[PDB]
Design a protein around this ligand. Structure first.
Ligand code: HEM
Ligand code: HEM
Ligand SMILES: COc1c(O)c(C)c(C/C=C(\C)CC/C=C(\C)CC/C=C(/C)CC/C=C(\C)CC/C=C(\C)CCC=C(C)C)c(O)c1OC
Ligand SMILES: C/C=C(C)/C=C/C=C/C(OC)[C@@H](C)[C@H](OC)[C@@H](C)CCc1oc2c(O)c(OC)cc(OC)c2c(=O)c1C
Lengths: 430, 55, 385, 62, 125
């Protein structure tokens, strides 16, 4: 458990633990939330040439493995080494992001990569209905606002993208003040920071990105009815918490109370979740899962679900929203306590997997926003300190009689109108 | 309007307050109307005619 | 499919009356319900034809009924059918209720069925009282007086309710005219409650004399129980006919052939026979308020039986102690009625107070204790450890 | 067209500088309708109930 | 009244040889007067089934007992409607009048009671 971050000319962040391999990468503070409607998908395209057969063979000769991830707030390019080769990873990083960042964009490479992210993003829209729905949830929830842009980009902005768009983006966002270099694995801080302060040369230092306009939640829906699909997939959310919200953890705990479910897993049917008494009688769904998604400016708190019970979708939604009503008025001590324990377990399994590439992404994203990483033991202190009173005060502000955002696809004829769903965000009282 | 958010604060008005307000309304409204009505018809009422008779 | 199934109106008829799956073993005790529907029809039809000749003014009401008796062609038949039919309506209702009591018909999943039944019973009692007042004989006037006064026992606002019900200082013209209007209305509310009763019946079906599931052997309503119903319909009509033609006044009170007199209450005043057990219960409590509370409670306590019957089997067919105490209850109820018909005099006052206790103790004490004991007896008689 | 490209609602959307503007208006209207209804129902019930009280012609002072 | 509770009271009586010798003869005579054996029924056939415990229990009954219960119930209804009893050689004998459904019922009540306990557990720190 370590967090050593220090700024030379660039900002260097590491977290070392004797494991096996080491992962080095640069993580930029700009993602799909920084694109336009019209160059949407430029980051995903950058990712895909960085992993192209040409660049990927040059790394595999050296015994290096490549990894990249496009998100909303950020963007990361990562090389995993075998831990004494922690220097030959920094060679491949700079040989790409200074030298080859004019050789990767060759006409034959770009056209074969663009053709591959087109088959890629098309395949997504055709078949991945849960993530497709969740992506459209962000699209309508945050419409005409940076968080609405999908991470993979749209088929139409993608096929109209040229080399100059990659260039213009790279020249405005792959800057020094919008970068953090991250090392996870087992390698020391002073083992890496010296290999970085070895070579100087700043490259476009002093240049800031471009500013924008703030993200906002708009209560709304997008309904992607398709009667030929064998199920209905729906996601429903309120405006949640940004990272570095006081209620960052209260929100995450609230989502753990209702948790996630899988009708076919015997153990899942037995969880201490009151909602399960309602939904199992007539089998109202195959699965659901609650989430508290947090970004820089905003977040989404809600749930997603999939079902073949297409004539009782209204009972699914009704029982789920009646449970959420309880958070404001009647959530019990032992529900909160169950959530604490399970939130710790899952937050643990995230922050300490046996895979440094995940560690890098979690470290990178955190330090880009607040300039530091809160340690796992520090989180548990915050989690344990949450009372029933906290959850109630949170839910009464975020959940009770608040606008929602809805998205769905498949057989959603039985998903009732907006106002019916929205009325269930509260209860009648004297 | 922020006159609403002082009394009821982004929540709807509850039945108990509605019922209570209705009892108040009934009396106030009736007096306001009877007053206007009897005034508008000054001179014609039995009230006014009795003031000009004595036996 | 067959038209009786596909048509929107006929399918209702088919699912309730033709194809409705009945347990093969229900006995003639399950014929009472159809006899109650028949009774409801007899009362409504004969009442409407009489209404055509009836005047509700307090000066004219008694004479307008004498006019039905004397001048209206077959008028005495209509009046005697109505009056004797009301009595037969209660005889059959008591049997329908007693059947329910014996066979555990009030039990889950038929609690709603039972509760709606208790409402119908209250409404039927109120309807017959309203009709009885319309004759405006001596029993009419004092019945109206005594029963509207039940409400004067209500704390603070009781005498206000009574003067509002009367429409004045005492039982007068306003009173009898509004009681006729109400007597005409409530039969139709009873009809709507009967439909709600049959709706709750339909989702679980009838029970049967064994108290167990009927699902393994059903036979259709049509033919079997249509013609079985016909047997008791004719027997019912035969007996009603013997009263209407041969003994039309045996179930009534001679004082109601005397026009009502606001200044004189006959010494011979007695409630209608079907109200006597309840009357006795009220008379047994030497306090005004508690008298009327206890009497109403004697009806509401019927609602308690699904909870105080602790047994694990439905019905009394295989229960030796429950059968015995059931008949204690029935004959105790008859005694309550015989006490009601008697004078407030020495042996009778005490007997009525003890019978009243037995009435309530049955639901609240005997059934929970005995059904628990029978539960345990069934167990230790077969388990060998 | 791409389903991620949400159509224009600018003509309908209240340019949100006041968040609870429509909510406060809606809840005032819904509240006021509730008030005047309950008073109306009360008056209607009293009208009918009072028609059963002693009529003007039967209040004789003997 | 739950079968867990009937079993509690009944077993207490059955063990203590004061009560055991006093009551069981009374109970034996009650069962014969009940008369259900003359219709070809076992007591457990008589238990009201329209509730979740009894539906769970009947669901878990082995096939062969299930078909047998079905026959005994149908045969009882047919005899009832003819206003007869069975030939005496067809009556259920006391050796046959076993609590065959009781173990499934008790098992289901315990499972249900635990769920109710666990759904309502308090926590102390
Ligand atoms: C469940 C239905 C009804 C019951 C239990 C019932 C019962 C009674 C009773 C007990 C009487 C007094 C009988 C007597 O003369 O001693 C009566 C009178 C009367 N009923 Fe009904 N009634 C019912 C429905 C109706 C209906 C729908 C009408 C239609 C207007 C009606 C009209 C009358 C009239 C005109 C009288 C006065 C004539 C008479 O005394 O027989 N009744 N009713
Ligand atoms: C005008 C009155 C009523 C009508 C027309 C009516 C009609 C019926 C009918 C057609 C049935 C099915 C056949 C039968 O079991 O007889 C039924 C069943 C039943 N009724 Fe009524 N009923 C009336 C009043 C009541 C009352 C007063 C009660 C109880 C307070 C009641 C309790 C029940 C119960 C519990 C059953 C189910 C019996 C069983 O299947 O074991 N009913 N009724
Ligand atoms: C599962 O269990 C059942 C079961 O469901 C049924 C249906 C039956 C059979 C019994 C019945 C179907 C009873 C049905 C009857 C009713 C619901 C009647 C409702 C009551 C009424 C009063 C009908 C409405 C009548 C009128 C408005 C009167 C019409 C008036 C007229 C024509 C006036 C004419 C005069 C002039 C001058 C124009 C069973 O026996 C049974 O168990 C064995
Ligand atoms: C608009 C409708 C109104 C106001 C009234 C309806 C509701 C009231 C009832 O139940 C619904 C009511 C009939 C009651 O039910 C508890 C019955 C059991 C009445 C029992 C009853 O009868 C009597 C009776 O008949 C008489 O005749 C000569 C005389 C009586 O004194 C001597 C009585 C009497 O002392 C009692 C208790």
């Amino acid at each position: 458990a370590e967090v050593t971050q220090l700024s030379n000319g660039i900002v260097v962040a590491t977290e070392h633990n004797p494991a096996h391999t080491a992962s080095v990468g640069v993580v930029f503070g700009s993602g799909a939330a920084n694109e336009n409607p019209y160059n949407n998908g430029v980051s995903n395209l950058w990712k895909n040439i960085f992993l192209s057969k040409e660049n990927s063979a040059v790394a595999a000769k050296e015994g290096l493995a490549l990894s990249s991830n496009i998100s909303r707030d950020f963007q990361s390019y990562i090389v995993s080494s075998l831990p004494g080769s922690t220097d030959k990873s920094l060679d491949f990083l700079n040989q790409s992001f200074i030298q080859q960042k004019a050789n990767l964009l060759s006409s034959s490479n770009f056209e074969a990569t663009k053709k591959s992210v087109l088959k890629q993003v098309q395949d997504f829209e055709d078949n991945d209905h849960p993530n497709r729905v969740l992506e459209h949830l962000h699209s309508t929830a945050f419409q005409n606002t940076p968080l609405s842009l999908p991470t993979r980009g749209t088929l139409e902005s993608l096929e109209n993208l040229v080399v100059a768009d990659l260039e213009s983006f790279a020249n405005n966002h792959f800057l020094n003040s919008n970068a953090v270099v991250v090392g996870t694995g087992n390698i020391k801080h002073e083992d890496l920071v010296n290999s970085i302060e070895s070579k100087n040369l700043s490259l476009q230092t002093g240049t800031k990105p471009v500013l924008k306009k703030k993200a906002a939640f708009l209560g709304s829906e997008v309904r992607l009815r398709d009667d030929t699909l064998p199920k209905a997939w729906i996601s429903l959310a309120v405006e949640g918490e940004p990272v570095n919200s006081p209620n960052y953890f209260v929100a995450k705990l609230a989502a753990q109370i209702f948790g996630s479910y899988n009708a076919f897993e015997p153990a899942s049917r037995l969880q201490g979740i009151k909602l399960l008494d309602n939904i199992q009688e007539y089998q109202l769904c195959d699965n659901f899962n609650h989430f508290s998604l947090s970004y820089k400016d905003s977040g989404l708190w809600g749930f997603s679900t999939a079902t073949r019970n297409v004539t009782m979708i209204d009972d699914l939604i009704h029982f789920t929203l009646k449970q959420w009503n309880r958070l404001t008025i009647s959530v019990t001590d032992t529900e909160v306590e169950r959530a604490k324990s399970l939130l710790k377990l899952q937050l643990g399994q995230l922050y300490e997997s046996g895979n440094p590439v995940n560690d890098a992404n979690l470290l990178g994203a955190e330090v880009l926003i607040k300039g530091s990483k809160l340690s796992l033991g520090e989180a548990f202190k915050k989690i344990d300190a949450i009372t029933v009173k906290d959850v109630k005060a949170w839910a009464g502000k975020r959940l009770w009689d608040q606008d929602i955002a809805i998205a769905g696809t498949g057989q959603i004829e039985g998903l009732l109108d907006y106002m019916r769903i929205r009325s269930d965000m509260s209860m009648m009282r004297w | 309007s922020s006159l609403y958010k002082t009394f009821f604060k982004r929540n709807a008005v509850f039945v108990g307050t509605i019922f209570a307000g209705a009892f108040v309304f009934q009396t106030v409204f009736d007096t306001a109307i009877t007053s206007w009505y009897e005034n508008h018809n000054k001179g014609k009422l039995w009230k006014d005619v009795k003031a000009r008779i004595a036996a | 499919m067959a038209f009786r199934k596909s048509n929107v109106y006929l399918s209702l008829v088919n699912s309730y009356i033709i194809d409705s799956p009945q347990p093969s073993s229900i006995n003639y005790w399950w014929n009472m319900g159809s006899l109650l529907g028949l009774c409801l029809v007899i009362q409504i039809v004969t009442g409407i034809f009489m209404a055509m000749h009836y005047s509700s003014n307090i000066e004219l009401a008694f004479s307008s009924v004498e006019h039905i008796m004397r001048d209206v062609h077959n008028g005495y038949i209509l009046r005697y059918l109505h009056a004797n039919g009301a009595s037969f309506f209660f005889m059959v209702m008591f049997m329908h209720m007693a059947k329910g009591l014996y066979y555990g018909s009030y039990r889950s999943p038929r609690v709603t069925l039972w509760n709606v039944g208790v409402i119908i019973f209250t409404l039927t009692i109120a309807t017959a009282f309203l009709g009885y007042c319309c004759v405006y004989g001596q029993m009419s006037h004092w019945g109206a007086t005594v029963i509207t006064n039940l409400f004067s026992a209500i704390p603070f606002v009781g005498n206000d309710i009574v003067s509002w019900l009367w429409g004045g200082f005492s039982v007068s013209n306003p009173t009898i005219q509004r009681f006729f209007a109400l007597h005409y209305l409530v039969p139709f509310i009873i009809a709507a409650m009967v439909i709600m009763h049959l709706m709750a019946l339909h989702i679980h079906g009838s029970s049967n004399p064994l108290g167990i599931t009927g699902n393994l052997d059903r036979i259709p309503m049509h033919s079997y129980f249509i013609f079985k119903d016909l047997v008791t319909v004719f027997l019912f009509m035969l007996i009603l006919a013997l009263f209407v033609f041969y003994s039309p006044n045996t179930l009534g009170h001679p004082d109601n052939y005397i026009p009502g007199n606001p200044l004189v209450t006959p010494a011979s005043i007695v409630p209608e026979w079907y109200l006597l057990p309840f009357y006795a219960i009220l008379r047994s409590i030497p306090d005004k308020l508690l008298g009327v509370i206890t009497m109403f409670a004697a009806i509401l306590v019927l609602l308690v039986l699904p909870f105080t019957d602790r047994s694990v089997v439905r019905g009394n067919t295989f229960k030796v102690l429950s059968k015995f105490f059931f008949f204690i209850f029935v004959f105790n109820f008859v005694l309550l009625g015989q006490i009601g018909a008697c004078h407030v005099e020495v042996p009778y006052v005490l007997m009525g107070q003890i019978a009243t206790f037995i009435y309530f103790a049955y639901f609240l004490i005997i059934v929970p204790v005995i059904s628990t004991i029978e539960n345990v007896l069934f167990y230790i008689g077969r388990v060998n450890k | 067209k791409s389903t991620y490209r949400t159509p224009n609602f600018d003509d309908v959307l209240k340019e949100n500088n006041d968040a609870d503007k429509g909510r406060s208006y809606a809840y005032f209207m819904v509240g006021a309708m509730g008030l005047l209804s309950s008073a109306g129902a009360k008056s209607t019930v009293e009208t009918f109930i009072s028609s059963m009280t002693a009529t003007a012609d039967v209040l004789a002072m003997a | 009244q739950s079968f867990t509770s009937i079993a509690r009271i009944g077993d207490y009586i059955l063990k203590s040889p004061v009560l055991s010798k006093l009551c069981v003869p009374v109970a034996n005579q009650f069962i014969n007067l009940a008369g259900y054996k003359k219709l070809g029924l076992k007591f457990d056939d008589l238990i009201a089934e329209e509730n979740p415990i009894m539906q769970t229990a009947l669901r878990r009954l082995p096939e062969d007992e299930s078909y047998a219960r079905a026959y005994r119930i149908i045969r009882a209804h047919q005899t009832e409607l003819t206003h007869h009893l069975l030939p005496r050689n067809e009556w259920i004998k006391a050796q046959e009048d076993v609590p065959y459904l009781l173990p499934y019922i008790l098992e289901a009540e315990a499972a249900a009671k635990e769920k109710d306990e666990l759904d309502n557990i308090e926590v102390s720190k």
